[PDB]
Amino acid sequence: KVFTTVDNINLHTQVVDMSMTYGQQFGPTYLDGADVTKIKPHNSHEGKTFYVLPNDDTLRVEAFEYYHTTDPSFLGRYMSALNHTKKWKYPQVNGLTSIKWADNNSYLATALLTLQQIELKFNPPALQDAYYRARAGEAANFCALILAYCNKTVGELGDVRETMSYLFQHANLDSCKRVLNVVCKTCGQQQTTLKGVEAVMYMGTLSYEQFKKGVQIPCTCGKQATKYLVQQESPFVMMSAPPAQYELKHGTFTCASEYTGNYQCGHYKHITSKETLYCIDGALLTKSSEYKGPITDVFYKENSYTT
Amino acid sequence: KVFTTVDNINLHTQVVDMSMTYGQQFGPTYLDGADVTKIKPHNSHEGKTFYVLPNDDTLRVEAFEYYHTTDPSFLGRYMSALNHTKKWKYPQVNGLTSIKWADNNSYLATALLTLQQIELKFNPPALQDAYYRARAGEAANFCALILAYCNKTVGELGDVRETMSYLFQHANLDSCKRVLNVVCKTCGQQQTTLKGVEAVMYMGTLSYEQFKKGVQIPCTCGKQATKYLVQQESPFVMMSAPPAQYELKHGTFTCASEYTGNYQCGHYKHITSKETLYCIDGALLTKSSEYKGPITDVFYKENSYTT
Ligand SMILES: CN1CCN2c3cc(C(=O)NC4(c5ccc(NC6CCOCC6)c6ccccc56)CC4)c(N)cc3OC[C@@H]2C1
Numbered sequence: 301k302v303f304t305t306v307d308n309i310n311l312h313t314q315v316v317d318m319s320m321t322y323g324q325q326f327g328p329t330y331l332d333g334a335d336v337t338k339i340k341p342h343n344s345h346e347g348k349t350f351y352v353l354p355n356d357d358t359l360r361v362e363a364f365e366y367y368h369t370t371d372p373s374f375l376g377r378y379m380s381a382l383n384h385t386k387k388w389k390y391p392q393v394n395g396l397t398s399i400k401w402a403d404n405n406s407y408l409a410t411a412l413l414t415l416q417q418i419e420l421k422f423n424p425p426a427l428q429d430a431y432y433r434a435r436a437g438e439a440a441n442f443c444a445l446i447l448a449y450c451n452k453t454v455g456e457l458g459d460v461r462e463t464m465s466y467l468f469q470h471a472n473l474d475s476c477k478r479v480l481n482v483v484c485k486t487c488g489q490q491q492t493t494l495k496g497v498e499a500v501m502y503m504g505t506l507s508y509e510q511f512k513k514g515v516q517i518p519c520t521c522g523k524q525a526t527k528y529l530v531q532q533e534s535p536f537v538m539m540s541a542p543p544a545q546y547e548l549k550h551g552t553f554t555c556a557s558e559y560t561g562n563y564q565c566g567h568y569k570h571i572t573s574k575e576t577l578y579c580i581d582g583a584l585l586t587k588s589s590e591y592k593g594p595i596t597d598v599f600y601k602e603n604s605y606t607t
Numbered sequence: 608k609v610f611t612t613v614d615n616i617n618l619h620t621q622v623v624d625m626s627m628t629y630g631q632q633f634g635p636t637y638l639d640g641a642d643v644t645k646i647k648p649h650n651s652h653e654g655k656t657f658y659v660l661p662n663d664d665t666l667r668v669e670a671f672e673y674y675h676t677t678d679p680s681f682l683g684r685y686m687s688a689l690n691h692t693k694k695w696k697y698p699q700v701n702g703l704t705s706i707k708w709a710d711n712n713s714y715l716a717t718a719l720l721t722l723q724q725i726e727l728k729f730n731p732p733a734l735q736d737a738y739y740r741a742r743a744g745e746a747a748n749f750c751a752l753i754l755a756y757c758n759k760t761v762g763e764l765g766d767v768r769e770t771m772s773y774l775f776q777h778a779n780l781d782s783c784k785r786v787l788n789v790v791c792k793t794c795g796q797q798q799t800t801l802k803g804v805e806a807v808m809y810m811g812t813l814s815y816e817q818f819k820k821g822v823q824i825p826c827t828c829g830k831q832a833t834k835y836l837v838q839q840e841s842p843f844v845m846m847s848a849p850p851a852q853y854e855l856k857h858g859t860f861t862c863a864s865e866y867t868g869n870y871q872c873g874h875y876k877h878i879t880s881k882e883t884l885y886c887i888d889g890a891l892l893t894k895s896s897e898y899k900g901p902i903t904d905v906f907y908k909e910n911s912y913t914t
Pocket residue numbers: 457458459460462541542543559562563564565566596
């Protein structure tokens with residue numbers, strides 16, 4: 301005798317035949333992340349709640365309302381990550397929820413720390429609820445959700461900028477706006493405008509001040525141009541560039557991705573400017589005044605910048 | 608001035624404009640595994656050969672002839688694994704090509720060692736050529752191919768039995784045949800027959816002798832039955848079962864998968880019966896007479912067994 305859900309908000313009452321297994325009466329069934337499909341209902345977990353897959357239209361609508369997918373694989377990939385992430389340790393590091401290193405989760409830690417430091421509202425209630433609970437220190441469900449929403453499995457190598465990009469795509473960034481302009485000696489002037497995720501991300505450089513002062517592109521014409529920002533209305537910007545030695549000076553950035561190693565065969569650290577510089581490497585904490593090292597993402601805080 | 612290929616057998620001669628980059632004249636282009644799409648043709652690699660994606664019908668047929676896919680992602684996922692696997696070390700361990708531990712490749716090592724010990728003919732010439740060359744000690748291309756053919760990326764956690772199953776599906780196993788029979792007290796007797804991959808794999812048990820003496824299934828009727836083998840015509844069989852403590856006795860099996868840890872969060876070792884028992888753990892070698900430990904796959908050698 302059990303409860304089933306797809307969202308864990310709405311609970312459905314089900315009495316489970318006690319020699320039938322779970323994946324036969326309900327269908328794919330789970331318990332705290334464990335595939336319990338092939339298991340018989342034992343006296344131990346009577347009265348507990350089980351995630352199931354949406355098998356009538358009520359459950360289907362509930363799953364969309366909460367996760368904003370109709371992907372039948374979604375729930376299974378989420379249960380499969382939770383089974384691991386719930387076994388990770390999430391230590392508080394300088395008042396941030398971090399992740400002790402496991403299962404190549406270095407990039408998740410760096411994402412998780414960044415997310416606590418930028419102002420982000422998630423569209424799927426499931427991401428939002430799990431984000432709140434992660435900020436409070438219970439970040440297993442959030443991490444398992446990040447893996448599901450990015451189509452990563454536990455252990456897969458990950459890109460912090462790519463993870464962010466996908467997460468930003470599930471966040472309300474509608475009020476975000478970027479007015480670019482490119483100087484074309486031949487074609488002239490031509491004012492691109494970007495809203496959403498595209499108004500918050502750039503991949504040419506780390507320095508927000510260098511963006512403001514014009515970055516190089518090759519104009520339609522062929523040879524090089526300069527591409528500078530005219531208006532940046534957003535709560536933050538994320539500047540990225542392939543990893544390189546870079547001086548992070550204290551007080552001029554919110555936080556940064558440090559990455560050491562080859563493309564994919566490498567390890568991310570998080571660097572964040574508080575009253576001094578903090579290197580957060582999973583459960584480990586380093587504190588320094590200046591910092592030179594290989595950075596690939598820097599986060600900046602905005603309101604409404606105009607050129 | 609370069610050569611392009613998709614197979615590396617057929618070489619196409621191309622002269623490459625020397626201020627245009629590669630991914631503009633050809634398309635997605637590669638060099639020894641490196642995405643060279645965004646790179647200009649430098650004097651260093653003139654006269655070398657580049658993998659490209661199939662962009663006319665000649666290249667398309669050549670790619671199928673060699674790899675047996677028409678999947679446009681195939682070649683890119685392969686180049687992306689090669690870039691890593693070519694950096695792995697492949698030490699000879701007791702006359703077998705093994706892999707020094709990197710990038711969670713424990714399951715690949717165990718597959719690679721097993722593959723050198725069972726009799727397997729691959730259908731895609733690319734797998735066959737790279738298998739020969741791996742048996743000789745140059746196993747980077749084979750491993751990168753295994754990752755591509757299984758849709759694994761480098762670092763992903765892997766299942767040795769699942770990898771084998773997919774590889775078997777690209778091998779000639781047409782002469783393989785399994786005649787089962789199930790004892791149903793109510794329904795009666797009923798002689799299943801299996802050919803191909805399905806005639807070589809079983810997931811209930813490790814002991815081939817226990818298979819021969821009948822394994823438990825629940826007959827259509829509901830309650831339990833016994834399912835035993837009547838004819839096993841194949842060069843080998845692979846017996847698998849979820850990991851458990853198990854005594855491998857020397858001389859009664861070809862090789863075995865040892866796995867320690869949780870579902871997915873674990874580490875594979877290879878155990879192989881030569882003149883004594885060898886534990887091969889990547890580049891490391893242990894030798895013992897008996898062996899108790901957590902086994903999940905055992906390989907056996909056959910000709911044409913009849914009950
Ligand atoms: C489709 N995606 C793309 C790859 N992606 C991925 C990337 C990474 C990764 O490493 N991403 C970084 C990176 C490292 C190195 C680069 N280029 C070097 C070339 C010359 O040397 C210095 C820089 C980069 C050049 C462009 C952009 C990112 C570069 C650290 C930021 C990783 N860890 C896991 C990953 O999972 C799979 C996922 C699948």
